[PDB]
Design a binder for these strands. Sequence first.
RNA 1: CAGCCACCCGAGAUUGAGCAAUAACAGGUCUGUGAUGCCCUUAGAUGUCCGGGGCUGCACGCGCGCUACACUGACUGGCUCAGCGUGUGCCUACCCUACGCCGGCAGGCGCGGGUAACCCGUUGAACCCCAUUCGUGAUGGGGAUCGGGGAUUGCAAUUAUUCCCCAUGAACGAGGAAUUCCCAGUAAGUGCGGGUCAUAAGCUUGCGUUGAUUAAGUCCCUGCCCUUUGUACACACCGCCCGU
RNA 2: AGGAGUGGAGCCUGCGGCUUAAUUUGACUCAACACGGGAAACCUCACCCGGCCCGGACACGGACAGGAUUGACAGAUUGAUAGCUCUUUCUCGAUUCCGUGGGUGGUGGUGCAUGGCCGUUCUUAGUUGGUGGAGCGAUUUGUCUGGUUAAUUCCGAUAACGA
Lengths: 33, 97, 225, 72
Amino acid sequence: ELGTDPYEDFQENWNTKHSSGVTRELMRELNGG
Amino acid sequence: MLMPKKNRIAIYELLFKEGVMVAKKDVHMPKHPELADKNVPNLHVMKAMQSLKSRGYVKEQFAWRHFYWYLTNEGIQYLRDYLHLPPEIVPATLRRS
Amino acid sequence: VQISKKRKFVADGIFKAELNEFLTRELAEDGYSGVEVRVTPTRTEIIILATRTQNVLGEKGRRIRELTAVVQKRFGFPEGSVELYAEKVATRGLCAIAQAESLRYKLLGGLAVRRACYGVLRFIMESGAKGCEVVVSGKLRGQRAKSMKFVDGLMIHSGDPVNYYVDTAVRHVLLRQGVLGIKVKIMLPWDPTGKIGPKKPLPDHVSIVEPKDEILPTTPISEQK
Amino acid sequence: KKRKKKSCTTPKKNKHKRKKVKLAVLKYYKVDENGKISRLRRECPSDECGAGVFMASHFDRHYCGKCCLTYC
RNA sequence: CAGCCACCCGAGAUUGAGCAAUAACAGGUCUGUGAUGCCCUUAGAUGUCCGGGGCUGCACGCGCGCUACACUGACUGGCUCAGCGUGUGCCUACCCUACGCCGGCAGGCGCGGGUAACCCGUUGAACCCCAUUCGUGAUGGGGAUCGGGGAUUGCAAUUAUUCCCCAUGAACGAGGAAUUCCCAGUAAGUGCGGGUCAUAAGCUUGCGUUGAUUAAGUCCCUGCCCUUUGUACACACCGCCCGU
RNA sequence: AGGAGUGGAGCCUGCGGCUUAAUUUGACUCAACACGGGAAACCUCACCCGGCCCGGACACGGACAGGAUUGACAGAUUGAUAGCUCUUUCUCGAUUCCGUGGGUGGUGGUGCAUGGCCGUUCUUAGUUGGUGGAGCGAUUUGUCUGGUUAAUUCCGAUAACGA
Ligand SMILES: [Mg+2]
Ligand SMILES: [Mg+2]
Ligand SMILES: [Mg+2]
Ligand SMILES: [Mg+2]
Ligand SMILES: [Mg+2]
Ligand SMILES: [Mg+2]
Ligand SMILES: [Mg+2]
Ligand SMILES: [Mg+2]
Ligand SMILES: [Mg+2]
Ligand SMILES: [Mg+2]
Ligand SMILES: [Mg+2]
Ligand SMILES: [Mg+2]
Ligand SMILES: [Mg+2]
Ligand SMILES: [Mg+2]
Ligand SMILES: [Mg+2]
Ligand SMILES: [Mg+2]
Ligand SMILES: [Mg+2]
Ligand SMILES: [Mg+2]
Ligand SMILES: [Mg+2]
Ligand SMILES: [Mg+2]
Ligand SMILES: [Mg+2]
Ligand SMILES: [Mg+2]
Ligand SMILES: [Mg+2]
Ligand SMILES: [Mg+2]
Ligand SMILES: [Mg+2]
Ligand SMILES: [Mg+2]
Ligand SMILES: [Mg+2]
Ligand SMILES: [Mg+2]
Ligand SMILES: [Mg+2]
Ligand SMILES: [Mg+2]
Ligand SMILES: [Mg+2]
Ligand SMILES: [Mg+2]
Ligand SMILES: [Mg+2]
Ligand SMILES: [Mg+2]
Ligand SMILES: [Mg+2]
Ligand SMILES: [Mg+2]
Ligand SMILES: [Mg+2]
Ligand SMILES: [Mg+2]
Ligand SMILES: [Mg+2]
Ligand SMILES: [Mg+2]
Ligand SMILES: [Mg+2]
Ligand SMILES: [Mg+2]
Ligand SMILES: [Mg+2]
Ligand SMILES: [Mg+2]
Ligand SMILES: [Mg+2]
Ligand SMILES: [Mg+2]
Ligand SMILES: [Mg+2]
Ligand SMILES: [Mg+2]
Ligand SMILES: [Mg+2]
Ligand SMILES: [Mg+2]
Ligand SMILES: [Zn+2]
């Protein structure tokens, strides 16, 4: 099952309260670390 | 809902014979069109089918003003045991003609 | 007695509309695409177009045998005049209704909105459409509602060619916190045959043929045969 | 707008409670020592109410409860 | 060059509508929905029927309109021309009407056609046209408000449903500040269909008929777009901000 | 530049007020106010006064063929021929009735939780990539001095080309 999309989360919450989280998630999706 | 037992018998017999049921959702209709010469008001049909649905015996759909009801396997067993029908009797739906 | 032609045509239209609504509500899960009623004095045939016919038919044909029953019960015309058939759509990617239903059921399963929209867009474009647009509106995130827009390819908006070059579909999906709305537009490709696209071209597209090679004449030659 | 209650009327209109009668069949028949049965309650002259449907012995009238037939 | 003006020929040298981008508004709609999330109520009901009232109640202000203030008129006769459309209905009761007779009229009786280019229907429309009477008099202009009768729709007409007949005969003599719409078969005048409709148009949406004055320009008013420019504004001038 | 006007009169209709038991309610500059297709005698109806009905599915418990329950003639009662209640007894036969949960129905509240639809900015002429060019960058050119058009319509000029 495909539950969470980091790209959508960042693009939607980049200016919200949960920005610092989603950015931190997006890097994990990109750099593999 | 309170109703004479013969109305329930007629409704269940029609449902098991055909396998499906259709109603117009009109509590003031004097009698169901299909159940003619038996004097069954439409409200009795609606409430009986609602009681059957609550127990899972029939599946329900609603379209534009009408109730459509289909008979489930457990509903088939319940009607067969209720009407004391022989195990050799099946609704017309289950016959691939 | 009989009714006038105006009432007759209006009644036929209303019957078709109600039949389509009922079939939509019944067979949304099966990728219901459309209904086609062919009236013959012997029997009135109804063709049901859906992505998969196995669920519509049911086991041993039970479910369809139910539908042709209730229809006969609903509209009241006599038994033996009803017969339903299920036919799969030629191409499911070029149908806006089927794609809207697919997106709705992907969202209902818990899939991410953006991922599902992009998957539907990619499938539509791979099917061969000129372009596609998908709009999702509602309470996607938070108490404040918004709208996401995904576009690709070409798209026309105004004029008469919109009628036969654009396929549109609007759907609703009920999620835990309210209703989400889905709009899908697909621009059909031009096809000389009428199978998967409009036969006529766009009004403003002019195709000038390349002239053929001609041998330059040098000396008068008379040929008798 | 919000609904106002305004809950004040005749204190309580009571619903009719049906009387509980024990073995109402017995009082329809009287029995002698010889074993005879005599029907105390009159039998209605109607079609359906002919044999077992007894009437009502009101102080000034006879009343069949199944068809509302009334006699002096 | 892109194109503009005039003219010939020509039915026509600019017919009128429909559809209409990217982005937004805390615009309207939960009282259109068996679209719908949360609250509230659920048998002394905010559910649902029945009976009677109200939604129309009148010291006063504000909009959209109808009729008028007359002689380029009103009244009484005579003559003569349209177009767009509707019509007997699942539930569902309720259609359009020719012809004969009765009544002064609203209407009432008969007896026929039409599920419609077939019948109403050659849709004998109104303005308009030709004669008659009146004669600048709030007048035979205007028709508000009231009295007494008659008839139709309905289960039911009173707080008058609607319609007909006698009688009554108000303001109104062209309208302050301010303000709306419009460039040709157009504006205005005049009727006729459709929607609502058991009863039914001073509203709306269409259709014809009669048929103009003025203009082929501008950025003065109003508003909206561009370019340059200034900003301490960015919740964006309904801003920001200083001192008692 | 003009035509017909409205604003003045009488009346018809909507909106405020003021009255009322209730005079239900939405909408308030264009972009509310003969608008909700809203011309309401009853219904519509959502407001007020009074009275019936359950059309409270389903599960558990209780009670029940020695009867769970249903309906009703007369007199009283009522606006009423609602057995709605009271007196009186009759009738019905497991369909119901009492409690606990759990559901259903709402023209009830939120359009500032939403969908869809509609209106408006604006029916004006506007809008946007891709490769190239210029900037550390946000960003900019394309999308322009000028003529032309109803029109970012076209011709032209041109670090922009095609779209
Ligand atoms: Mg185009
Ligand atoms: Mg166009
Ligand atoms: Mg608001
Ligand atoms: Mg809505
Ligand atoms: Mg609602
Ligand atoms: Mg709601
Ligand atoms: Mg309303
Ligand atoms: Mg009542
Ligand atoms: Mg009432
Ligand atoms: Mg009103
Ligand atoms: Mg208006
Ligand atoms: Mg006026
Ligand atoms: Mg008018
Ligand atoms: Mg004249
Ligand atoms: Mg006069
Ligand atoms: Mg005269
Ligand atoms: Mg005349
Ligand atoms: Mg006078
Ligand atoms: Mg006079
Ligand atoms: Mg009178
Ligand atoms: Mg009144
Ligand atoms: Mg008079
Ligand atoms: Mg009209
Ligand atoms: Mg009318
Ligand atoms: Mg109106
Ligand atoms: Mg100016
Ligand atoms: Mg300065
Ligand atoms: Mg600046
Ligand atoms: Mg006037
Ligand atoms: Mg005036
Ligand atoms: Mg006035
Ligand atoms: Mg006002
Ligand atoms: Mg209200
Ligand atoms: Mg405007
Ligand atoms: Mg109103
Ligand atoms: Mg009225
Ligand atoms: Mg009345
Ligand atoms: Mg009533
Ligand atoms: Mg009323
Ligand atoms: Mg009960
Ligand atoms: Mg209610
Ligand atoms: Mg509702
Ligand atoms: Mg809003
Ligand atoms: Mg909305
Ligand atoms: Mg919108
Ligand atoms: Mg670039
Ligand atoms: Mg670049
Ligand atoms: Mg660079
Ligand atoms: Mg730019
Ligand atoms: Mg220009
Ligand atoms: Zn009897």
